[PDB]
Nucleic acid binder design. Structure first.
Length: 71
RNA sequence: UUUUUUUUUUUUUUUUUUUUUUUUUUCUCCUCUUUUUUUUUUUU
């Protein structure tokens, strides 16, 4: 049963990964999401998507230390 | 008015046999980063 569990989890992750496949995310209106947080880490705060349901740790600090501002 | 003679197609057939796919090289080798590892639950 635990193996089955892992199967559903990584199968669905892969199915979502192809939702974000090659078909150009530049002109099809399937690009912008929203975001809340739930936990702080030392390079990027953990993000969440209420409209799809995906998680993942992002980064504010980038490789060249070129940290973000906004206009 | 122009007779007579000068051989031709090698002889032979009534011999035994108890093996067996292939076949014969090439060295040691830096796997990058949010984690502990999540977990009940219900609709197949």
């Amino acid at each position: 049963n635990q193996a089955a569990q892992h199967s559903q989890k990584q199968s669905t992750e892969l199915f979502q990964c192809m939702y974000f496949k090659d078909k150009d995310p530049a002109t099809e209106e399937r690009c912008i999401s929203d975001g809340v947080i739930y936990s702080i880490r030392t390079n990027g705060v953990l993000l969440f998507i209420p409209r799809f349901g995906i998680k993942g740790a992002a980064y504010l600090k980038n490789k060249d230390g070129l940290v973000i501002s906004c206009g």
